[PDB]
Amino acid sequence: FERHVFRKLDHTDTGAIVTVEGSGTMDEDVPVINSGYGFNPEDDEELEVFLLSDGSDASGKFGVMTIPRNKQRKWPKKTGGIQHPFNADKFVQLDDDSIWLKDGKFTLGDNRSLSITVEGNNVVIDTGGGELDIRSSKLMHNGVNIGDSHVHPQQADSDGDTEADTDPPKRD
Amino acid sequence: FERHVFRKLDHTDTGAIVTVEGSGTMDEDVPVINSGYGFNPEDDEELEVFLLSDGSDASGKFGVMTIPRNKQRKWPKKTGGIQHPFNADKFVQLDDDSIWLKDGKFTLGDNRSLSITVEGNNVVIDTGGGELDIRSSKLMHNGVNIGDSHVHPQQADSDGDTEADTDPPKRD
Amino acid sequence: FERHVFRKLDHTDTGAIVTVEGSGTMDEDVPVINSGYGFNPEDDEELEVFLLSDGSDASGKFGVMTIPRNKQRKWPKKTGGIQHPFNADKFVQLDDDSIWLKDGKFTLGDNRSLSITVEGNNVVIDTGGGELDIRSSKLMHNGVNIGDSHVHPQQADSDGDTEADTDPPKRD
């Protein structure tokens, strides 16, 4: 077990190659362990990379990258999750109340087409890349039918001849 | 390498101070390797904490906190993801069918304003924060246009006179 | 410290037990430390599993599983997250631009009832016959009110001439 500090990370076919100081430990270190979480920090950024030696052989040293210590989120009690490796306020939380995500902009899909924003507590859903079709038995807004089964009542006309509720939305 | 049990965890500027028993290995075993996933367990939990010493130096020790042994989910074949640290029901799964999130409630945004729930197969989308605005070339419920371009057919009045299709929704 | 390949993973009450190919080092091995992220690979998969021993005692030794490196994602600079352990294009990214999820299908809830798709930007939201109820001070589409507070102007009767706007959508 030994301790060194990160400078440079490069990609290859079978993992990531890093140079982590501690003298010129190696220009191209043996690939790093992922275990599910990985990131690509910028060149020469504060963070530390522990190296584990295969047996006692100095020829093999797997790194264990860690989030920068200035940027570790102080999670609340009985909570956990993952976070942006360079900021403590863009994270994902799985709690006893609800699956909580925090960020100033949300996106989904292959090409980030489905974009959702919660700016100022409002809702701005943007999917301008195509059509929007919803399936649901009976739709509301504030508990009032606004979907495919609503009808608009009429009122008195110029001749005073009252009318009834109009027909539902047209079918193409 | 050595194994230990968890006693108490408190936050710190550049890590997480933890007591791990083992005859009191240290009142604050400051280092806690953070590779993306972390949590703040309650005092005196069943989970087991391993300690790793920098080289052979017994002064420096790094902890590797683990999910409690008695609360580990049994994932299905060809699946993986992160889970609620203290329960096997609230989790996230990335599979060959769909990005699956399981929980009894859903919240988003900076202050959980955008709240979504899925109870008893139903859908309850709450955005009490404020206004809701959607951008899309269409809005079709069950495949029927109810968006900004729908229009209502009209029927005969008390005078027997038939009108034409209604105008689109009023524009502010 | 040693390094080996994965052979077969079996579930058990105390955790997940995996047998590796260290000359049959153990058919019923010490479990895989579950630091949040875990997965259940198919039998005889190519991935590689390390193994550490509690102290120098060879009787007990924990292993740490790694994502197979032929399916390792090459994250962009200033980015990180978790991925599908068997594919590099099914992942979640927490960036400095937006919380990004990539997948051909999206599901939520206890039983995947709330299903969302973003195929070709053609947003398709399916609730499996559920009751979609939305709460918001004002619902809009393309910047036009189509919610619970929209009204429809109408046309001129035949011998009845003009008339006022319609009533709001019918209540239940």
Side-chain angles (χ1 to χ4, degrees):
Chain A
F1 200 114
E2 69 275 16
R3 276 170 102 220
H4 313 313
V5 54
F6 164 77
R7 310 220 180 290
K8 174 192 331 183
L9 197 150
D10 263 358
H11 306 303
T12 187
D13 190 36
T14 55
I17 62 170
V18 65
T19 292
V20 298
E21 267 295 326
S23 199
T25 187
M26 181 155 198
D27 194 39
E28 287 201 325
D29 195 359
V30 59
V32 173
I33 319 181
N34 286 94
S35 190
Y37 210 83
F39 49 104
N40 188 349
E42 67 278 12
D43 272 316
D44 210 325
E45 164 51 27
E46 288 184 353
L47 62 95
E48 183 178 1
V49 176
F50 313 97
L51 282 72
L52 292 193
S53 85
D54 182 7
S56 187
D57 301 332
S59 303
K61 283 184 181 289
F62 317 111
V64 171
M65 293 177 71
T66 187
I67 297 170
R69 277 179 287 278
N70 296 115
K71 326 171 194 172
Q72 293 179 356
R73 168 172 149 73
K74 292 143 194 161
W75 295 78
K77 275 287 175 213
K78 44 192 191 283
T79 45
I82 51 165
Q83 63 178 355
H84 181 230
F86 315 105
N87 214 8
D89 290 74
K90 294 174 83 78
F91 51 85
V92 177
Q93 174 171 332
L94 288 92
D95 208 357
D96 296 339
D97 174 24
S98 169
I99 278 168
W100 177 20
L101 291 72
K102 186 149 178 166
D103 186 4
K105 183 181 152 200
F106 306 153
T107 176
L108 294 174
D110 280 286
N111 303 307
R112 282 195 179 182
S113 65
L114 199 165
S115 188
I116 303 184
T117 310
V118 179
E119 65 183 1
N121 316 321
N122 291 313
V123 181
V124 177
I125 298 184
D126 191 335
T127 80
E131 293 179 353
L132 163 53
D133 188 31
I134 298 162
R135 331 292 175 71
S136 56
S137 71
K138 181 266 289 180
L139 176 58
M140 284 74 74
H141 179 211
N142 296 294
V144 174
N145 206 342
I146 301 299
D148 190 19
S149 61
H150 73 117
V151 296
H152 283 265
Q154 271 266 10
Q155 68 291 2
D157 63 357
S158 296
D159 286 356
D161 291 296
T162 50
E163 317 187 345
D165 310 336
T166 187
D167 281 319
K170 291 176 180 54
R171 301 193 169 198
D172 293 330
Chain B
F1 194 103
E2 62 272 16
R3 193 155 93 225
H4 290 76
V5 65
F6 162 96
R7 180 55 36 79
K8 161 174 70 178
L9 193 148
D10 291 331
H11 296 310
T12 318
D13 194 35
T14 61
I17 53 162
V18 66
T19 294
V20 288
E21 194 74 328
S23 199
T25 60
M26 181 85 188
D27 183 29
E28 41 274 28
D29 187 359
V30 160
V32 175
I33 305 175
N34 207 337
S35 178
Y37 184 110
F39 49 107
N40 189 345
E42 299 175 356
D43 272 299
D44 300 62
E45 186 50 29
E46 178 185 356
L47 60 88
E48 302 145 90
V49 169
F50 317 94
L51 319 176
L52 289 172
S53 65
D54 176 20
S56 192
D57 176 5
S59 304
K61 277 159 274 154
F62 313 107
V64 176
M65 293 177 70
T66 193
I67 276 176
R69 53 140 280 151
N70 203 1
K71 310 155 183 165
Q72 263 184 30
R73 170 169 144 78
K74 294 139 192 160
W75 298 80
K77 279 284 184 204
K78 306 246 196 171
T79 59
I82 59 164
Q83 64 169 130
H84 191 283
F86 293 99
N87 186 272
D89 176 354
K90 290 192 178 218
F91 54 79
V92 67
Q93 171 173 333
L94 281 79
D95 211 343
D96 300 351
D97 177 20
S98 168
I99 279 168
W100 178 20
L101 293 73
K102 186 154 183 162
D103 186 0
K105 185 179 160 194
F106 309 74
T107 62
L108 294 174
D110 286 292
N111 288 335
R112 288 191 175 165
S113 58
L114 192 159
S115 186
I116 304 177
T117 307
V118 174
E119 71 195 340
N121 185 51
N122 290 330
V123 175
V124 193
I125 299 181
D126 190 336
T127 77
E131 321 206 320
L132 172 58
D133 193 29
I134 316 177
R135 332 294 177 70
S136 58
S137 73
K138 260 185 160 184
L139 191 83
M140 294 177 71
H141 179 223
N142 305 61
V144 176
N145 201 345
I146 62 170
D148 183 29
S149 63
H150 63 87
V151 293
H152 290 257
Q154 183 159 342
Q155 65 287 3
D157 65 354
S158 178
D159 201 4
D161 299 286
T162 42
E163 290 215 320
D165 298 328
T166 300
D167 283 319
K170 172 145 271 175
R171 293 197 163 171
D172 298 337
Chain C
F1 194 99
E2 51 266 30
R3 169 154 70 119
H4 295 89
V5 296
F6 157 87
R7 194 143 286 286
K8 179 173 72 176
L9 192 152
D10 291 331
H11 299 314
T12 178
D13 193 39
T14 55
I17 62 170
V18 67
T19 178
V20 295
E21 194 49 281
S23 185
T25 195
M26 192 85 189
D27 69 342
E28 207 184 45
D29 197 12
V30 172
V32 162
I33 61 192
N34 210 344
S35 183
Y37 187 99
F39 58 95
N40 188 347
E42 65 277 335
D43 291 331
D44 212 327
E45 173 61 344
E46 60 198 303
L47 72 165
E48 197 162 359
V49 175
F50 315 93
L51 264 166
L52 307 98
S53 66
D54 173 31
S56 197
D57 177 2
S59 303
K61 43 203 190 283
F62 302 90
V64 61
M65 293 177 71
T66 191
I67 281 165
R69 57 206 97 190
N70 315 324
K71 307 185 286 292
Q72 192 73 240
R73 170 169 152 74
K74 293 141 190 157
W75 296 79
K77 224 74 184 171
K78 303 289 223 212
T79 62
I82 60 164
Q83 69 172 319
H84 182 232
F86 317 105
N87 211 14
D89 189 358
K90 299 208 73 159
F91 53 84
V92 62
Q93 169 173 333
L94 277 78
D95 214 337
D96 59 3
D97 182 1
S98 183
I99 277 166
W100 180 18
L101 293 72
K102 203 171 180 175
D103 181 0
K105 185 180 163 195
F106 306 70
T107 58
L108 294 174
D110 275 302
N111 290 336
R112 286 194 188 163
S113 88
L114 196 165
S115 190
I116 301 168
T117 309
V118 193
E119 171 285 338
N121 317 328
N122 298 340
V123 173
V124 180
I125 298 177
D126 188 341
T127 57
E131 301 216 0
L132 169 49
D133 191 26
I134 316 178
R135 332 293 179 71
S136 62
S137 66
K138 181 173 72 175
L139 173 68
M140 294 177 71
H141 181 210
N142 316 77
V144 174
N145 193 343
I146 65 164
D148 189 31
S149 61
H150 74 309
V151 294
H152 282 259
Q154 52 180 349
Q155 55 278 6
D157 283 323
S158 48
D159 70 0
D161 293 343
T162 51
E163 46 179 2
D165 294 333
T166 65
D167 282 352
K170 169 154 281 301
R171 297 197 172 194
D172 287 339

